[PDB]
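Below is our example:

___
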Amino acid sequence: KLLQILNVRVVGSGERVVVLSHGFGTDQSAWSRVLPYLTRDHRVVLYDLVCAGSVNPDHFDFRRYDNLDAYVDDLLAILDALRIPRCAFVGHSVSAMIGILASIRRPDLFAKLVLIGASPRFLNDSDYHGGFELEEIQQVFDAMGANYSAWATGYAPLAVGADVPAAVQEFSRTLFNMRPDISLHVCQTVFKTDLRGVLGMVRAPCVVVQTTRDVSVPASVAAYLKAHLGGRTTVEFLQTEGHLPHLSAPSLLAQVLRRALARY
């Protein structure tokens, strides 16, 4: 079942296992440029989220995946299936949220988290700056429904951030492959998620990767995570911008991953 359905791949080798888990609009191919920096040293597990365009969309149960817990269930089932008792987990965006929840459910299994493009809550609240307002997201949801292709075309370069045409082309490729109803549903699920209250339950050490601008993650979010995450947390800075550094600046991201994954 799950190992086939979610395109699970295990590559490299080592006692140090690391799971790479992609974000919204991409699939595991997003990791392809960083992957060669990890596989000499680590056993690496890749998989696609059930909402990825590279997964048959008829597996997407809208009821089941109404919250991120169901995505955590998939991740845990994959690791249990592979008989992995201990790993480091690298998660981008929605997968950083999944990683946080999964590390709380199973603190035995998650030795270290690396969180990229990460936020505990995207909507603003009283003295909390998430980056988004309700009326704004309502318009986003309408645009995704009215003309998904036009929405995706506009979003891709903004997510990449830096003027890196090859990264825009690549992210667009996978974004256009998400089924639009699934896309909208995931987008809604992420915007209703608020992990602020459970951050202190994370016991794993955490590296939060901050780029110099992310359209979906204000600069203040990383300090917030560092202040509230319950494990030993550091913020590591890349000297370039964007929400998708694994696509736009993979060599630089790989340096941070090699150091973060050295011991755990």
